[PDB]
Amino acid sequence: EPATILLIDDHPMLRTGVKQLISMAPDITVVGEASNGEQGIELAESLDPDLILLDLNMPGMNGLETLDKLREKSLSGRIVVFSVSNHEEDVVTALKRGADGYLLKDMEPEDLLKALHQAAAGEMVLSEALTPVLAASLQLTPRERDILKLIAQGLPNKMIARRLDITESTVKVHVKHMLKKMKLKSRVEAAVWVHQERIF
Ligand SMILES: [Pt+2]
Ligand SMILES: [Pt+2]
Ligand SMILES: [Pt+2]
Ligand SMILES: [Pt+2]
Ligand SMILES: [Pt+2]
């Protein structure tokens, strides 16, 4: 029952530390690791983790390429990236490319832990500061409309499941289907869209 996390990076000491941090929280767990983008895309697709942690600082300068390719697959979880830096343009680019959030490698262990846990097993809404960025870039089953409404509120898969009295597996199936259906690449984008048009 703990939330699953897929780690994609090629930065040993960072992964070593992140693993230690994840051990401090029983309700979250690492389901897979990958030091190669291609391998990571394979694991992402077959495991469909609640959280995919991607490092954009990977060798070959193809971190943003792996993101495009992940966003091509049918995923129902969240993708949080380790930004190159805290510069506005490095951040907005990641979000525009399909990431739900971003983290910095120089965060304090205590704060990083809270961020990973929130992204994997908690509520997570985009800050108003970054909302216009996604807004700039921007046939539904009754059950899917219910799921979309809750997604707009930032609820994770598990909370949505225990709310609509459905199994988490069917939630994931519904999320990836209506997402790929409505031409939406991420959950934050789905949330921003809904609020933009005030569907609810
Ligand atoms: Pt710790
Ligand atoms: Pt601890
Ligand atoms: Pt701790
Ligand atoms: Pt919750
Ligand atoms: Pt919860």
UniProtKB/Swiss-Prot annotation:
Gene name as annotated: narL
Function: This protein activates the expression of the nitrate reductase (narGHJI) and formate dehydrogenase-N (fdnGHI) operons and represses the transcription of the fumarate reductase (frdABCD) operon in response to a nitrate/nitrite induction signal transmitted by either the NarX or NarQ proteins.
NCBIfam families: PRK10651.1 (NF007935)
Protein name per the record: Nitrate/nitrite response regulator protein NarL
Pfam family, one: Response_reg
UniProt entry keywords in alphabetical sequence: Activator, ATP-binding, DNA-binding, Nitrate assimilation, Nucleotide-binding, Phosphoprotein, Repressor, Transcription, Transcription regulation, Two-component regulatory system
CDD domains for this protein: LuxR_C_like (cd06170), REC_NarL (cd19931)
Gene3D superfamilies: 3.40.50.2300, Winged helix-like DNA-binding domain superfamily/Winged helix DNA-binding domain
Residue ranges of the annotated DNA-binding region, renumbered to this chain: 157-176
Ranges of residues in domain HTH luxR-type: 139-198
Entry's Gene Ontology molecular function annotations: ATP binding; DNA binding
Positions carrying 4-aspartylphosphate: 55
InterPro entries the UniProt entry points to: CheY-like_superfamily, Sig_transdc_resp-reg_C-effctor, Sig_transdc_resp-reg_receiver, Tscrpt_reg_LuxR_C, WalR-like, WH-like_DNA-bd_sf
Stretches assigned to the Response regulatory domain: 4-120
GO process terms (BP): nitrate assimilation; phosphorelay signal transduction system; regulation of DNA-templated transcription
Organism listed in the record: Shigella flexneri
